[PDB]
């Protein structure tokens, strides 16, 4: 039934190889936050030569299955990975921090095996407004996963972009009300904050 959903971008990938090879292509891997990014600010991707490959609802396991077709075969200079939100959501099954982290490491190793540079990013803050303990538990699980990612990134000299620290508001780490409406997906103002951070990091890598 095409569990990884390679069908979603199969035709779009064909149209890209037909348009030729591009200089300094950046592919964005992620879920609805990344898919909605292109839908909400098409100019940011069009004007900069960025290619969005987000699919809503997907986990880091889906991203690993799509990595070769949706990243490697597009011969990009750089890949931006944002993964973990739906792993934690458990819409596809029980969360396992070690499995999620391992999927990210597998994607990094596939990218480096193909001379594709990597930028790792933080799982975004997430609203769990049932009560205060629910929000704290959600925030603690996100920080715990991001801690694994940042330690791996530092150890392997991979840039890490910390969306979380700039978008999570006190006291319990809820996604800032200025940056969201549903507490999960950024608004355009929220995306503008992420764009400044990731563009600075991309430009440093691409030189």
């Amino acid at each position, epitope marked *: 039934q095409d569990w990884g959903n390679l069908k979603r971008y199969a035709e779009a990938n064909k149209e890209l190889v037909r348009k030729g090879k591009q200089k300094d292509r950046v592919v964005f891997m992620g879920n609805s936050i990344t898919e909605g990014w292109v839908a909400n600010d098409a100019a940011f991707f069009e004007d900069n030569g960025y290619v969005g490959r987000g699919i809503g609802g997907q986990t880091s396991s889906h991203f690993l299955l799509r990595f070769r077709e949706d990243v490697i075969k597009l011969a990009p200079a750089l890949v931006v990975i944002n993964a973990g939100t739906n792993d934690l959501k458990e819409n596809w099954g029980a*969360y396992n*921090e070690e499995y999620t982290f391992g999927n990210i490491v597998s994607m990094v190793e596939l990218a480096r095996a193909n001379k594709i540079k990597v930028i790792l990013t933080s799982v975004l803050p997430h609203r769990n407004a049932r009560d205060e303990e629910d929000q*704290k*538990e959600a*925030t*603690q*699980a996100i*920080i*715990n996963l*991001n*801690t694994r990612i*940042i*330690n791996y990134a*530092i150890e392997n000299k991979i840039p890490f972009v910390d969306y*979380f*620290v700039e978008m*999570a508001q*006190s*006291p*319990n*780490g809820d996604l800032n009300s200025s940056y969201t409406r549903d507490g999960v997906h950024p608004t355009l103002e929220g995306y503008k904050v992420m764009e400044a951070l990731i563009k600075k990091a991309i430009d440093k890598v691409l030189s």
Partner: antibody
């Protein structure tokens, strides 16, 4: 092996100040949060303060807030506790303690810490005239 | 007010040498998160600093003898000494580090005799 050596303790007049130091060795000090914990005579252990690996975040026990300042020098592998306006109830053996977690992200004051995997020998602070 | 409270009930226990010592610790709220128990045990002899005995509720630190074991989850935890040795007479601390401030509970093991 991991060593933590505290110094700076002694008898100090109420109201005065005192600076404790904790010299660390045997581990990459700059990548771990560090803690101060104290034990008053005949009492249990009371956590005092934590400082993140990069010194960006510091949190304190309510009992010392506004009077104590935790700091670190990662180039010297040394942790400090600056104690101001000392009171008789601050009398205790003060321990520095290493946090078990690598580069913990202490973005908020309530987040999980590690367990305290290594402790110093302690330095006695006696606040008395 | 929101600090997690650690309590040992009873807070003192007299155990005959050679017999089983069981120390119970209770937290005011669950300290288990993502299948991990944020509960540590420490031993302190007089004039000595505390020493880590058990971490993640049930993992012995290197060098700790086999007669020490920890168990429990959620709000109820136990430190067991299968056969009490004279060198095991000490103060014992249970510690949660699930939330800041990390907090400790205290109890003593003493030798029972006639």
């Amino acid at each position: 092996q991991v060593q933590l050596v505290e110094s700076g303790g002694g008898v100090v007049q109420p109201g005065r100040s005192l600076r404790l130091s904790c010299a660390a060795s045997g581990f990459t000090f700059s990548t771990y949060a560090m803690h101060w914990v104290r034990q008053a005579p005949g009492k249990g252990l009371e956590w005092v303060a934590v400082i993140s690996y990069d010194a960006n975040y510091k949190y304190y026990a309510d009992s010392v807030k506004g009077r104590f300042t935790i700091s670190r020098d990662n180039s010297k592998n040394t942790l400090y506790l600056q104690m101001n306006s000392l009171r008789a109830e601050d009398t205790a053996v003060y321990y520095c303690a290493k946090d078990s977690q690598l580069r913990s992200l202490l973005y908020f004051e309530w987040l999980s810490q590690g367990y305290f995997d290594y402790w110093g020998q302690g330095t006695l602070v006696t606040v008395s005239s | 007010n929101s600090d997690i409270v650690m309590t040992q009930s009873p807070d003192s226990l007299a155990v005959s040498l050679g017999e089983r010592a069981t120390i119970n610790c209770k937290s005011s709220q669950s300290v288990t998160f993502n299948y991990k128990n944020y509960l540590a045990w420490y031993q302190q002899k007089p004039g000595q600093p505390p020493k880590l005995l058990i971490y993640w509720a049930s993992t012995r630190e290197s060098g700790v003898p086999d007669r020490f074991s920890g168990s429990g989850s959620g709000t109820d935890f136990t430190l067991t000494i299968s056969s009490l040795q004279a060198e095991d007479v000490a103060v014992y601390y249970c510690q949660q580090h699930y939330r800041t401030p990390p907090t400790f509970g205290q109890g003593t093991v003493e030798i029972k005799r006639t």
